[PDB]
Every structure is written in structure tokens, then in C-alpha cells.
Amino acid sequence: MQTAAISWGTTPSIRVYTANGNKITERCYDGSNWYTGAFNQAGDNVSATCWLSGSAVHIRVYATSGGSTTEWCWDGDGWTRGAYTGL
Amino acid sequence: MQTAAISWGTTPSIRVYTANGNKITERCYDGSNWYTGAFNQAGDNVSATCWLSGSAVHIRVYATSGGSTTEWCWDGDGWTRGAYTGL
Amino acid sequence: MQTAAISWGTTPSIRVYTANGNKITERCYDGSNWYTGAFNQAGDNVSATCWLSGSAVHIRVYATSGGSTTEWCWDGDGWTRGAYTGL
Ligand SMILES: CC(=O)N[C@H]1[C@H](O[C@@H]2[C@@H](O)[C@H](O)O[C@H](CO)[C@@H]2O)O[C@H](CO)[C@@H](O[C@@H]2O[C@H](CO)[C@H](O)[C@H](O)[C@H]2O)[C@@H]1O[C@@H]1O[C@@H](C)[C@@H](O)[C@@H](O)[C@@H]1O
Ligand SMILES: CC(=O)N[C@H]1[C@H](O[C@@H]2[C@@H](O)[C@H](O)O[C@H](CO)[C@@H]2O)O[C@H](CO)[C@@H](O[C@@H]2O[C@H](CO)[C@H](O)[C@H](O)[C@H]2O)[C@@H]1O[C@@H]1O[C@@H](C)[C@@H](O)[C@@H](O)[C@@H]1O
Ligand SMILES: CC(=O)N[C@H]1[C@H](O[C@@H]2[C@@H](O)[C@H](O)O[C@H](CO)[C@@H]2O)O[C@H](CO)[C@@H](O[C@@H]2O[C@H](CO)[C@H](O)[C@H](O)[C@H]2O)[C@@H]1O[C@@H]1O[C@@H](C)[C@@H](O)[C@@H](O)[C@@H]1O
Ligand SMILES: CC(=O)N[C@@H]1[C@@H](O[C@@H]2O[C@@H](C)[C@@H](O)[C@@H](O)[C@@H]2O)[C@H](O)[C@@H](CO)O[C@H]1O
Ligand SMILES: CC(=O)N[C@@H]1[C@@H](O[C@@H]2O[C@@H](C)[C@@H](O)[C@@H](O)[C@@H]2O)[C@H](O)[C@@H](CO)O[C@H]1O
Ligand SMILES: CC(=O)N[C@@H]1[C@@H](O[C@@H]2O[C@@H](C)[C@@H](O)[C@@H](O)[C@@H]2O)[C@H](O)[C@@H](CO)O[C@H]1O
């Protein structure tokens, strides 16, 4: 089981991505309880990065399944497939 | 052997967490030599994130041992167990 | 195959490091297409962190090959070996 962690803002908000059993899932903290996030994609390995434009977070998650990495994008309205390609 | 890296401030300070042999340890840079940090917890996988409140760093380390992830918190006065729960 | 991801600035710029087959490589985004970066070093595991001094990025990549981690530094003019030592 393998994780990636990101955080932003002053609360802060935290997101922890966990790869387990070929599934990546997401747990979320926004200042009170931890909860399960919307992100669900295939993979055995995960990394992530984020940035703020004002108060709005943008997240990129790099989900690797076997020999292929897929980027997933959060830009305020759902998870969308990004343009990233690997070697 | 698997690592996680965080950094903050303008020096910068860097912390590198290494999982090896079911032990996670910490090496630290604050502008001169690298040294061994106080963090020691069980795990075969590690991620980390941090933020600043003014000059004061807050660190969260996610230590995974088998099928369970535990959060460890640095908030200026020692490492304490966090509220994070996984699936 | 295992990745690390960093990002900076407002574009943003993103760097994704991938360890595969004992080689770590780098893919780069600066606002248009993804491209292959200059970084190439040995390892089966990678983490990374970065910071800005004004507009200038500084990157540290921690490349682990077997039982040894080596730090690699980007400070505006090529990749150089850092002072990091592990246990
Ligand atoms: C508190 C919370 O849950 N916020 C989530 C929110 O997730 C909800 C679920 O709580 C609910 O059960 O289901 C609905 C779908 O019917 C939804 O998935 O979704 C919102 C809207 O996308 C998002 O809240 C925003 O979060 C940011 C954090 O900076 C900010 O506070 C903003 O004002 C909120 O509106 C939350 O979604 C999670 O966080 C995202 C950044 C991303 O990680 C998601 O995958 C998470 O589910
Ligand atoms: C330079 C240094 O060592 N700072 C450490 C400091 O660690 C010391 C050890 O050096 C000494 O050998 O043992 C004592 C215990 O008897 C202690 O563990 O501990 C201080 C206080 O917690 C902390 O320094 C603070 O670091 C921040 C960095 O932003 C800042 O400069 C502040 O002004 C300092 O007081 C250092 O602890 C390390 O960094 C922490 C953030 C965390 O990573 C720890 O696990 C590290 O040991
Ligand atoms: C757009 C781009 O490619 N920028 C790279 C640039 O890489 C070039 C290659 O494009 C070309 O094919 O080969 C030459 C060697 O002959 C070179 O490797 O290299 C520049 C200069 O080092 C660097 O651009 C700078 O990037 C920063 C990003 O913040 C900023 O925009 C600045 O103004 C640019 O000058 C790019 O190098 C990449 O990014 C680095 C941070 C690091 O990740 C490298 O390993 C990447 O190759
Ligand atoms: C926000 C931005 O800089 N660009 C968006 C486009 O690219 C997506 O995000 C960037 C950061 C990088 O992760 C890409 O791989 C990813 O595809 C995106 O394609 C476009 C879609 O309409 O939206 C831009 O805002
Ligand atoms: C600093 C903060 O926002 N909350 C602290 C509490 O939660 C701890 O930190 C947050 C960021 C998250 O990592 C939690 O899982 C973690 O438990 C903490 O329980 C409380 C203890 O007295 O202190 C708050 O400051
Ligand atoms: C930029 C800085 O704080 N120090 C540089 C020196 O150390 C290198 O960078 C730091 C952040 C840390 O990663 C070290 O392990 C790494 O060696 C560097 O040795 C020196 C070389 O001339 O340049 C400093 O600017």
C-alpha cells in the first residue's frame, strides 16, 4: 500500500491518495473530520501536486498502473483526464 | 527503500523521510549539515506534507505498515499521533 | 514504476520524475506541451521537492538505488550532486 499527500491553504486542507490492490482512493481533511473523496482511478502507485489560484485549488494526480502513468486533474468541477504522457 | 521529501522557507529547510526495513527515519537540513531528526515510526511506505503558520512549520507524515496508514504530526513540540484514518 | 511530482509558479510548471527499470527520468510541463527533461540518474525510487527564490526554481530530487539515496540539485544551471547523506 503506497500513499501521496498534498496540502494547501491555512486551515489547512489535506488530501491523502492511497494505492492499494490496483485502486487509488482519496481521503480528505478540510478542518474537522476526515472523509472519503470523489477520486477513484486505477493504479498501483500514486503521486500528486497542487497549487492555488486565489482560493481555488488545482490538483494533479499521477496514477501509475503497470508501465503507464495517467494524469488526473481537479480544477473545481470534477476529475478530468490530463494531457500528461510518459516515455 | 522509499523516500518522501518536503521543504519550506527561504533557507530552505528540507526533511527527507526514508522507509527501510519496516522503519521510517528522518534526515534534516536547516542550512548547513544534514542531521538525523527525531522522527522514528514503523512503516514500509511514507509520504509527507507541510505548511507554515508564519515562521512555524507544521508537518504531517503518513506512515504505512502493511494495510494500515498512521498520521504523525509535528506542530512545534514533538511528534504526536494524528486523527487520520484510511479505508 | 514509481513517480514523484512537483509544481511551482502560476502557470504552473510541473515536473514528474519516474523510476522504471533502475532509471529515473523526468517529464516537464511549462504551459503547453509535455517534454522530456534533462534529468537522468539511477534509481528505483524517487522523491522531490522544490522552492522559488523570486522567479528562479530550485529542485531537489532524492534518487534511491538499492540501499543508498543520492540527492540531485537543480539551481538554474544543470543537475549537480548534493550533500545529502542517509543513515
Ligand atoms: C466537505 C466536502 O465534502 N467537500 C467536497 C465535496 O464532496 C461532496 C461530498 O461531500 C458529497 O458526499 O458528495 C458530493 C457529490 O454529490 C461531493 O462529492 O465536493 C465539493 C465540490 O466539488 C468539494 O468542496 C470544495 O472543496 C474545496 C477545498 O479547498 C473548498 O473548500 C470549496 O469551497 C468546496 O466547495 C469537496 O471535494 C473534495 O475536495 C476536492 C478538492 C477533491 O479532492 C475531491 O475529490 C474531494 O471529494
Ligand atoms: C538544528 C536542530 O537540530 N533542530 C532540531 C532540534 O533537534 C534537537 C537535536 O538537535 C538534539 O540533538 O536533540 C534534541 C532533543 O534533546 C532535539 O531533538 O529540535 C528542535 C526543537 O524541536 C527543532 O528545531 C526547530 O526547527 C525549526 C525548523 O524550521 C526551526 O529552525 C526552529 O527555530 C527550531 O527550534 C529541530 O527538530 C527537527 O526539525 C523538526 C521540524 C522535525 O523535523 C524534527 O523531527 C527534527 O528533529
Ligand atoms: C522549455 C524548455 O525546454 N526548457 C528547459 C530547457 O531544456 C532545454 C531543451 O529544451 C533543449 O532541447 O535542450 C537544451 C540543452 O541543449 C535544454 O536542456 O533548459 C532550460 C535551461 O536550463 C530550462 O528552461 C528554464 O525553465 C524554467 C522553468 O521554471 C524557466 O521557465 C526558465 O526561464 C527557463 O530558462 C528547462 O529545463 C527543464 O526545466 C528545469 C527546471 C529542469 O527540470 C530540467 O531538467 C528541464 O530540462
Ligand atoms: C491550467 C492549465 O495550465 N492548463 C489546462 C490544460 O492542461 C491541463 O493542466 C495542466 C496544468 C497540465 O496538467 C496538463 O497536462 C493538463 O492537461 C487543459 O488541457 C485545458 C483543458 O481545456 O485547460 C487548461 O486550463
Ligand atoms: C492544526 C489543525 O488544523 N488541527 C489540529 C488537529 O488535527 C490534527 O491536524 C490536522 C491538520 C489533521 O492533520 C488531523 O488529522 C490532526 O489530528 C488536532 O487534533 C488538535 C489536537 O488538539 O489540534 C488541532 O490544532
Ligand atoms: C541553496 C543552499 O541553501 N545551499 C547550497 C548548498 O547545498 C545544497 O543545497 C541545499 C539546499 C541542500 O540540498 C544541500 O544538500 C545541497 O548540497 C551547496 O552545497 C552549495 C554549493 O556551492 O551551494 C549552496 O547554495
All structural domains of chain B with their residue ranges: 2-82
Cα–Cα dist A29/A35, whole Å:
7
Q: Please give the DSSP secondary-structure letter assigned to residue C78.
A: S
Q: Which of C16, C15, C71 is nearest to C43 (CA)?
A: C71
Contact check, Cβ <8 Å, B67/A10: no
Return the half-sphere exposure (C-beta side, CA atoms, 13 A cut-off) of residue B36: 5
CA B21 to chain CA centroid, nearest Å: 17
Task: Name B22's Cβ contacts closer than 8 Å, sequence gap at least 6.
Answer: B42, B43, B44, B65
Atom of ligand 4 nearest to the CA of A81: 17
Task: Name B82's Cβ contacts closer than 8 Å, sequence gap at least 6.
Answer: B60, B70, B71, B72, B73
Contact check, Cβ <8 Å, C18/A86: yes
Neighbours of C14 (CB within 10 A): 23
- For the CA of B53, the nearest ligand: 5
Cα–Cα dist C69/C61, whole Å:
10
Asked if residue C80 has its Cβ within 6 Å of ligand 3, the reply is no
With contacts defined as CB-CB under 8 Å, which chain B residues touch A25? 87
Characterize C48-75 residue by residue with b for buried, 16 or more Cβ atoms within 10 angstroms of its Cβ, and e for exposed: bbbbeeeeebbbbbbbbbeeebbbbebe
B82: exposed, middle or buried (Cβ count in 10 Å: 0-12, 13-18, 19+): middle
Contact check, Cβ <8 Å, C16/A66: no
Return the half-sphere exposure (C-beta side, CA atoms, 13 A cut-off) of residue B7: 24
Mutation pick from B8, B10, B13, B14 vs chain C, by most beta carbons of C within 10 Å, is B14
Q: Which CATH architecture has domain C2-82?
A: Beta Barrel (2.40)
Q: Are C26 and C16 in contact (CB under 8 A)?
A: yes
Residue in the block written with cell 548534493:
C82
The structure was resolved experimentally with X-ray
Nearest residue of A to residue C49 by CA position? Answer: A49
Neighbours of C79 (CB within 10 A): 17
Residues within a 6 A CB radius of ligand 6: B 11, 14, 29; C 60, 71, 73, 82-84
Cα–Cα dist C45/B13, whole Å:
22
Q: Are C71 and C56 in contact (CB under 8 A)?
A: no
Task: Name C84's Cβ contacts closer than 8 Å, sequence gap at least 6.
Answer: B16, B27, B29, B34, C60, C62, C69, C70, C71
Contact check, Cβ <8 Å, A51/C10: yes
Alpha-carbon distances, residue B28 vs A25, B32, B56 (angstroms) = 30, 10, 16
Q: Among C1, C5, C27, whose Cβ lies nearest the Cβ of A60? A: C5
Q: Which of B27, B22, C56, B51 is nearest to A50 (CA)?
A: B51
- For the CA of A80, the nearest ligand: 4
User: E strand or H helix at C49, and its extent?
Assistant: strand C45-53
